[PDB]
Amino acid sequence: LPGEGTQVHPRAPLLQILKVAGAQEEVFTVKEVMHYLGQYIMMKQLYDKQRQHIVHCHDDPLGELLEVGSFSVKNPSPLYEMLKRNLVIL
């Protein structure tokens, strides 16, 4: 994934999710994309209630993009691989 200044354009399925989280933009930095994904998970309360570094996305559109039912915020590989599939580097 690109550095802090480089801009990316999210593919439609990801952009849709960022929109739900309140994103108005169509072009982002990776950090901004990550901000809105965190907002999304928080709003939808997808994190495990007791162990909150675990996210359960099996019955959510986010899980369709990540292709996994759960992941750990401390093992973000699945997130980064999803972004590689869903970000156009500008």
Side-chain angles (χ1 to χ4, degrees), residues 31-48:
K31 185 170 183 178
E32 291 177 336
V33 174
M34 292 297 292
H35 162 86
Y36 282 109
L37 286 178
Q39 289 291 152
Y40 180 88
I41 296 167
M42 185 163 54
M43 294 169 73
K44 299 288 191 174
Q45 288 174 44
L46 299 182
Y47 51 89
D48 190 282

Side-chain angles (χ1 to χ4, degrees):
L1 292 66
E4 299 69 32
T6 302
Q7 298 194 127
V8 299
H9 177 65
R11 303 192 184 279
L14 176 55
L15 183 59
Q16 287 286 309
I17 289 176
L18 303 185
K19 293 300 180 186
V20 174
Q24 305 287 292
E25 317 96 297
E26 295 261 327
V27 172
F28 305 79
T29 63
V30 176
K31 185 170 183 178
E32 291 177 336
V33 174
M34 292 297 292
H35 162 86
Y36 282 109
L37 286 178
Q39 289 291 152
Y40 180 88
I41 296 167
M42 185 163 54
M43 294 169 73
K44 299 288 191 174
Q45 288 174 44
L46 299 182
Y47 51 89
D48 190 282
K49 302 172 178 60
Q50 294 78 208
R51 312 181 63 239
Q52 302 203 348
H53 63 285
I54 300 300
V55 177
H56 302 293
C57 47
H58 55 279
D59 197 40
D60 192 270
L62 175 59
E64 297 304 298
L65 285 181
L66 296 176
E67 306 179 341
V68 301
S70 299
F71 70 95
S72 172
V73 178
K74 298 180 187 170
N75 186 14
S77 182
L79 193 67
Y80 295 153
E81 297 296 317
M82 181 275 291
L83 292 182
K84 290 174 184 170
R85 296 191 297 270
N86 287 276
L87 293 183
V88 174
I89 309 305
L90 307 174

